[PDB]
Amino acid sequence: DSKTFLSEHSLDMKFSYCDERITELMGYEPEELLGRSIYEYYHALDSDHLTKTHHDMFTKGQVTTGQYRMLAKRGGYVWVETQATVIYNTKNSQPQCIVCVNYVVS
Amino acid sequence: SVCQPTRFISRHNIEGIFTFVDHRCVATVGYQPQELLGKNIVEFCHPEDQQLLRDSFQQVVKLKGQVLSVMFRFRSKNQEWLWMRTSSFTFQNPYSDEIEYIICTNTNVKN
Known about the structure:
Chain B: It is found in: Nucleus. Chain B: This is Aryl hydrocarbon receptor nuclear translocator. The complex is a heterodimer of chains A (106) and B (111). Helix content of chain A is 23%, strand content 40%. By secondary structure, chain A is an alpha+beta fold. A five-stranded antiparallel sheet of chain A has the order 2-1-5-4-3. Chain B has a single domain, classed as Beta-Lactamase (2-Layer Sandwich), CATH 3.30.450. In chain B, β1 and β2 form a beta hairpin. The chains are: A alpha+beta (106), B alpha+beta (111).
């Protein structure tokens, strides 16, 4: 509820949409994040296992990241867990975008 | 260089009521978010498709988190009945037992 924000990403994980609830949780305005890779915000120590998770994402269709730190606009990092779901084009069944349910645990 | 399909995300309770609407709904179906919130998506659905849409709510709940897609006609603000493909799945925060809700990605597609 109060700890959650939705996002949408292109297949390279750049933000194509972000829930306004993120502002209260991490300080960013959604417009700030549009077009930027979420990898720019992951803590360096979490990048590798998140890359592995997103690799499996296209094979599995839906994945959960487990816990990672994400850089907030101010105040340092927040702990997050994300469930990512691939949305497919009907005609060619090719991946279209990624929808993420992000929840803060710190 | 890439023409992207027009789409928006919404959240619904199991009954079909909009409980969240992403602002791209304006471009997609013509309505402001406040004009959809609190209303059942079935209200905007073509009569031929309404039961198919109702059934989709029930089915997506039984998929327990997996994605279901359905095609239906949605009455836009300007009264054009747009072909929409909605891919939906339920979510429940793993740390609690709040009732599942449905996340929908709604795209205006050719049919």
